[PDB]
Design a protein around this nucleic acid. Sequence first.
RNA 1: AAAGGGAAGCGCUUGUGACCAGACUUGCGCCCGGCGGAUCAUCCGGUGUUCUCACCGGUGCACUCCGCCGGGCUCAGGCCAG
RNA 2: CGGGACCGAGGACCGCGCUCUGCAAGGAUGCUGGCGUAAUGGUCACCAGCGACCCGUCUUGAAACACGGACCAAGGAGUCAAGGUUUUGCGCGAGUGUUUGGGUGUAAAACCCGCACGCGUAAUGAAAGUGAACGUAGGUGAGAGCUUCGGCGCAUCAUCGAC
Lengths: 150, 126, 52, 108, 139, 51
Amino acid sequence: GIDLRWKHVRSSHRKAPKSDNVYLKLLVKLYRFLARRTEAPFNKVVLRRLFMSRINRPPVSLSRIARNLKNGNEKKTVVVVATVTDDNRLLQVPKMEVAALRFTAKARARIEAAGGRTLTLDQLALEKPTGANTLLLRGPKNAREAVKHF
Amino acid sequence: VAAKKHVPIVKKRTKRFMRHQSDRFKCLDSAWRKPKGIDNRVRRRFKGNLAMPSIGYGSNKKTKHMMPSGHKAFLVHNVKDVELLLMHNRTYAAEIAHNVSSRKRIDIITRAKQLGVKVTNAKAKV
Amino acid sequence: IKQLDAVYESKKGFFLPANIVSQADLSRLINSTEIQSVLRAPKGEARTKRAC
Amino acid sequence: PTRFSKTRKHRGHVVGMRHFHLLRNHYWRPSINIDKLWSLVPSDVREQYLSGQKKDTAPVIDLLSHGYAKLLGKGRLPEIPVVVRARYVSAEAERKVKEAGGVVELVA
Amino acid sequence: SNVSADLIWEVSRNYNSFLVKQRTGTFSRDALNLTNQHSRKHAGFVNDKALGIVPAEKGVKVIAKKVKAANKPASSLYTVTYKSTARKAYKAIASQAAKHGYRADLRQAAVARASAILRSQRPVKPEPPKKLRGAAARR
Amino acid sequence: SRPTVTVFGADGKPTGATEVLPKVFSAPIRPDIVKHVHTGMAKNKRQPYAV
RNA sequence: AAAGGGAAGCGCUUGUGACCAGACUUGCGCCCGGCGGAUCAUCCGGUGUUCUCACCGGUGCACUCCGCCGGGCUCAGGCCAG
RNA sequence: CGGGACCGAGGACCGCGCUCUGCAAGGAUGCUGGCGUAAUGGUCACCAGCGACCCGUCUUGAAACACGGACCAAGGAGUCAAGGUUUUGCGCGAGUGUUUGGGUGUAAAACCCGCACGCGUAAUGAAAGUGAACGUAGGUGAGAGCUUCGGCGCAUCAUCGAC
């Protein structure tokens, strides 16, 4: 016998999505290839967040994007691996280039009306395969009723 | 035709795993049941008792589901079923299903002879 | 087939959904010049020789 | 569905004051902050006003038609004169509307 | 677009009407499936470029997918019958499988399938009689 | 431009007429959504039983 | 058919008796000889294609292809062993 | 330098080497004999050597006691509803929910419609009532990622401020 005071630890992170979305499966295959064949940490972060569940992908609004676009970030490509929502409190949308998992209809319309560009994550992989000149944004994770009641 | 060359087929255990006390009770089938009593000698693995099945008895991955000739059985119901084994005559043999009539068995056996596919139960209904 | 577009225009509260993927051809995406020109060189093959 | 349950796996192993006759309709006064005030304007007219193609007109907003009785004052307004008709208004909301160049009209 | 060979494989990889699943393996009834095995490489109906071989009365009949007629099933198959020497059939099949970059990974399987069909078209030899063995069978 | 689809006559031959393909044919193909909705929908004609 | 000197039953392993499943029966390839046929190579036309590859009709005039039958040879073939 | 035992995983080449025409160097080949069938192998019955208490159940710390079991077949015990809560998948998203109802129908299906309403979008107070920007929605220290290599800094945490 071998005395094992310590225990070998099985993985406590997602290795694959629980979702059955076929397009998400194709995106996961593409970003698995990118994370394997590139040095860019952006690709690994994007792959890991593609694995994530919905409460771990809180929505990001246009006002949050506009806040993070200030101070030299106006020309960077905004990357969100959640839903980009519209904020009607923001009356003037700045010109921006946003790549997201999905957009609401009003957010897409307001970005295109302000003159920015809307992309999917496979288009982001085509144009910035190393994540160059990107601004990676996450939504407020703790802004949930369950988290308030914890 | 002869099977594809393979490593020797080793069975770690050929005897079945008999259920405890099914030799003494006729209402107990011999099919294996794990004893869940806290004081059971088979469950506690006292020596001289029945063995318990476990994953250590598992067969070699290269020879799993191989019959002694080296083929893997594939159940067939008709000629179109047996024609799926056209590219696999060195690895797969055809087992005609039990509810196939004698004439259809004759047709299946003739087609499998043309394809060079071994039939495991070719002598039946003759 | 003429009336189908008006049928889907008349459904109020519903729009045809946007996909999360713009190009479904994964082979075209992976073997495009844009991705392949920035990749690291391969670190191995599909089959690995047994060392010892 | 019954085939997904754990039982199938476990088979084999088992103050203040009282208010009599309260009428909630007496206390109906929904509130909207001033940062949502321009969202009540229809979208094309709102974009014209925010772009600046309407320099001679002011929007008149009836909060009771949209289902609001009180104008609260969270947020900020653009520098556009707006006439707001409301049953109630907070002091800060009136102050911000007056800075924006409009007026708060009291209605019933 | 919304449709690709990868998308069709994700849709039909767990179940389709050509699937034959048993304990010892998963087979496919697809006419464009050389080796009759369920995989993305051999899923001919899934793939944009694909080859299939069927027996003729004498020789083989090879079908290939036309890429510009994928929405026209009546005119989507390029069909050639080889009823000649086996070497000529193998040469032509390898030519349409490898010379112009049309599924070069399938040329071994295609030549092997043509060889199997032509071999099956030979006359069968009579089997030796069954030898009775032991005591009860022999007597 | 948008793709077209051929129109066939009663004899099975093209009539020379084409139609613009409707936009719904470019919608995403989502078997998980289809299976969820079908599982819900197939239960809606059920008649109750009880002892 | 068998066992039985105050229980039987069961586990590991031989043995005896009885009863059985496979495997094997030959394959592929060269060199000769004898048959039976020209869907041998090239060229021409038509058609289809993956646009350079094929199919069909004419040309083979038998040192070329394709089957069959007799010999010979190499290799690979089942079980247990030295 | 002898004598003996057990084993032969892998399956084109690639490597480290050496005594370098080649080798004992990233895992067994070569030669030969008998037999080609119940001979090997397997199943069943029995003898032989060794091994081996009758199963739940209860109790406590555990045994013992106690209780159930003559045998076989068939039933035979964590279910449904309402309301919460956390997590997973999906749709839409500052909104969301067609199905009380109406329209329609190939008629308990499917399809379509909308007023109200529910929940959410604002809280606090017993109540009358009042009601959320000094600041690029603040400062400081961390912080993935990005960077024009000066910095910008997500989520989140700690602390000081503002309403």
